[PDB]
Amino acid sequence: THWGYTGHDSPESWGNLSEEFRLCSTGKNQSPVNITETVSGKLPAIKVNYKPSMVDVENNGHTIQVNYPEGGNTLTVNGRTYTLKQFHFHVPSENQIKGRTFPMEAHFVHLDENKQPLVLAVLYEAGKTNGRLSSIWNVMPMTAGKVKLNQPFDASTLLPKRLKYYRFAGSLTTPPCTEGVSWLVLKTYDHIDQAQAEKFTRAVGSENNRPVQPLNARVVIE
Ligand SMILES: NS(=O)(=O)c1nnc(NC(=O)CC2CCCCC2)s1
Ligand SMILES: [Zn+2]
Numbered sequence: 001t002h003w004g005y006t007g008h009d010s011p012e013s014w015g016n017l018s019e020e021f022r023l024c025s026t027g028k029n030q031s032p033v034n035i036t037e038t039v040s041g042k043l044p045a046i047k048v049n050y051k052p053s054m055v056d057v058e059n060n061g062h063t064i065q066v067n068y069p070e071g072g073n074t075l076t077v078n079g080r081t082y083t084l085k086q087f088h089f090h091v092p093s094e095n096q097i098k099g100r101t102f103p104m105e106a107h108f109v110h111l112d113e114n115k116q117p118l119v120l121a122v123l124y125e126a127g128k129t130n131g132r133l134s135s136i137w138n139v140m141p142m143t144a145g146k147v148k149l150n151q152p153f154d155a156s157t158l159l160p161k162r163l164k165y166y167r168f169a170g171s172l173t174t175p176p177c178t179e180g181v182s183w184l185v186l187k188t189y190d191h192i193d194q195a196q197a198e199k200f201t202r203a204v205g206s207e208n209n210r211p212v213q214p215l216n217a218r219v220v221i222e
Contacts, residue, residue: 003175004062004206011210014175024177030213031119031170031183032094038166038222046120046163046184047076050084052152059141062174063088063208064200066136066153067146073155075110075120077184082110082118087155091200093123094173094209095185102189103197105209106158107173117172118182120165122158127191132157137196142203160188167221173210187222 001018003009009017015025024030050073058065065088073084086109093105108120124130139147164187171179201207 005208005210006206014177017175021175021177023171023179024175027171027177027179027213028216029170029179029218030177031173031181032096032210032212033168033170033215033218033220034096034099034212035166035185035220036098038220041167041221043165043167043221044078046165048156048159048163049074049076049081050154050156050159052154052156054149055153056146056148057136057139057141058146059144059203061144061205063090063204064136064140066149066155075108075118077118080112080116082112082116084155085109085111087158089200090173090209091197091204091207092209094212095121095123095183096212097123101209104192104200106190108155108159116182117178117180118184119170120159121183121185122160123186123189124192125189127193129193130191130196133192133196137199140199140203158190160186160190162188164188164222168215168218170218171213 014021055066067086071083075082091104093102102123103126104124106122110118166185170183
């Protein structure tokens with residue numbers, strides 16, 4: 001069933017579009033969130049194991065996604081290795097820090113051996129063109145369709161050297177809004193410029209950011 005960010009299909013309505021999307025409205029750990037107060041805790045360090053891989057880029061009406069057919073881009077935290085299935089973008093950002101909304105957000109989506117989801121998010125400030133993201137922008141399908149990018153791609157370079165993060169539990173930010181998703185949101189911002197935001201949006205069709213969901217009982221660790 002169709003869903004989106006304007007009209008009757010918009011997030012306020014995802015629950016009612018079908019039986020499967022019901023959690024979108026009745027969830028109590030829904031993403032995104034606005035990150036206000038936090039608990040200072042001694043979090044486990046992220047280990048990054050990203051390397052050049054043969055990737056392919058997809059526009060599906062909703063977002064611009066880079067998919068990894070072959071495993072071997074992984075991420076280790078507290079003993080468990082999480083495999084990157086894909087990364088993708090939202091303009092503007094979905095999550096917020098202290099009321100604040102970022103020009104763009106990227107979500108690196110992993111599963112461990114046990115099919116336990118983990119999203120790693122990177123927020124982008126407005127600034128200089130993003131040189132590392134040009135490879136992907138330069139062949140971004142501006143209407144629905146999957147090309148297959150011919151230069152290996154190093155997600156390595158989209159992650160910062162400084163890897164402090166907010167930690168909470170949540171959900172898919174797109175239907176069916178499944179919960180039980182680990183969220184790790186990176187304190188070091190990257191950057192994109194005006195041209196890049198508008199181009200992603202041009203292509204996707206609209207702003208693609210679900211509204212911030214109430215934390216409820218959840219604590220964000222910092
Ligand atoms: N907008 S977002 O970053 O929260 C999303 N990222 N991935 C999404 N869906 C999938 O990755 C497929 C897969 C299917 C079942 C296991 C978990 C997720 S929504
Ligand atoms: Zn996302």
